[PDB]
Write a protein that binds this ligand. Sequence first.
Ligand code: MNH
Ligand code: MNH
Ligand code: MNH
Ligand code: MNH
Ligand SMILES: [Cl-]
Ligand SMILES: [Cl-]
Lengths: 99, 99
Amino acid sequence: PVVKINAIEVPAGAGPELEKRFAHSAHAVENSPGFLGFQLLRPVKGEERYFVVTHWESDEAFQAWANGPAIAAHAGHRANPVATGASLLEFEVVLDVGG
Amino acid sequence: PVVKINAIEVPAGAGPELEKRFAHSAHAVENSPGFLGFQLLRPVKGEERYFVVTHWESDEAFQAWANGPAIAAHAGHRANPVATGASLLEFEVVLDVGG
Ligand code: MNH
Ligand code: MNH
Ligand code: MNH
Ligand code: MNH
Ligand SMILES: [Cl-]
Ligand SMILES: [Cl-]
């Protein structure tokens, strides 16, 4: 499996506004093939970015979502971001261990 | 829940030895009170560090693991480290969405 973390830069005080924008976004990705879940992660220490952590069965499944549904899920919204920059961090899951 | 990512710098070519070390490490953390699982992530693009992504009920559950078990699990291990440095990135889970 793969992990794609989008590391997003957020201005001082904009955390609440950013999280509200994610709060009702589940529908946009929940039913994608090969999608294994995602978390919005609020930084607390050691990092200043929000980490949007997504898990996929394969890189192909991620690309498919990113190129179609993801762009479609923008239809009603403004494209005016609170985020000041972004970096996609991409990994291969080498070991996965549960509780 | 909380997420603690340890971001470890690892010289090119030591990835196999490092991954081999992690392949035999589950015993050291699993069944810890409040531990919810963890992944080793090999970097692919946008990062050169391995991300050790750990999930916990609470920060206190994480600290109790780090202050006892994690230190104890070093007893007897005569290997020299292959990692070059580490930075702890600490997060709060604001949103969790499954498949
Ligand atoms: C240039 C690039 C770019 C810009 C300016 C951008 C901006 C935005 C803004 C602003 C919003 C907030 C809308 C709102 O008011 O709720 C939003 C939401 C969102 N966007 Mn994007 N977005 C991308 C790229 C961009 N998006 C990429 C790339 C992805 C993923 C592959 C993505 C995924 C989303 C999803 C998913 C939402 C949430 C949709 C929803 O709630 O319906 N997009
Ligand atoms: C991992 C893959 C991933 C990529 C490359 C991606 C990329 C982007 C880019 C680029 C931006 C614009 C940032 C800026 O600095 O202007 C953006 C915005 C956004 N994205 Mn996302 N995005 C996701 C995943 C991704 N997003 C997922 C999963 C969701 C949740 C359903 C989501 C939801 C959003 C929302 C909401 C915005 C608007 C953020 C803002 O207003 O700052 N997304
Ligand atoms: C600071 C310095 C520091 C050094 C030099 C270090 C070095 C090592 C080396 C070398 C190994 C395994 C080698 C072998 O014999 O196969 C190892 C394993 C391990 N270490 Mn550490 N380690 C930490 C800190 C350190 N560790 C911290 C901090 C944590 C967590 C809070 C941690 C957790 C572990 C765990 C868990 C293992 C795996 C134990 C096992 O599989 O037996 N640690
Ligand atoms: C999250 C929290 C977390 C912290 C702060 C942590 C910290 C460290 C530090 C510091 C080092 C030494 C790096 C160096 O530069 O020499 C190290 C090494 C190590 N750690 Mn970990 N570590 C884990 C979690 C953590 N580790 C977990 C979970 C495991 C596996 C059960 C693990 C396993 C290792 C192994 C294996 C090593 C030895 C790496 C090597 O071979 O160089 N760990
Ligand atoms: Cl994002
Ligand atoms: Cl580590």
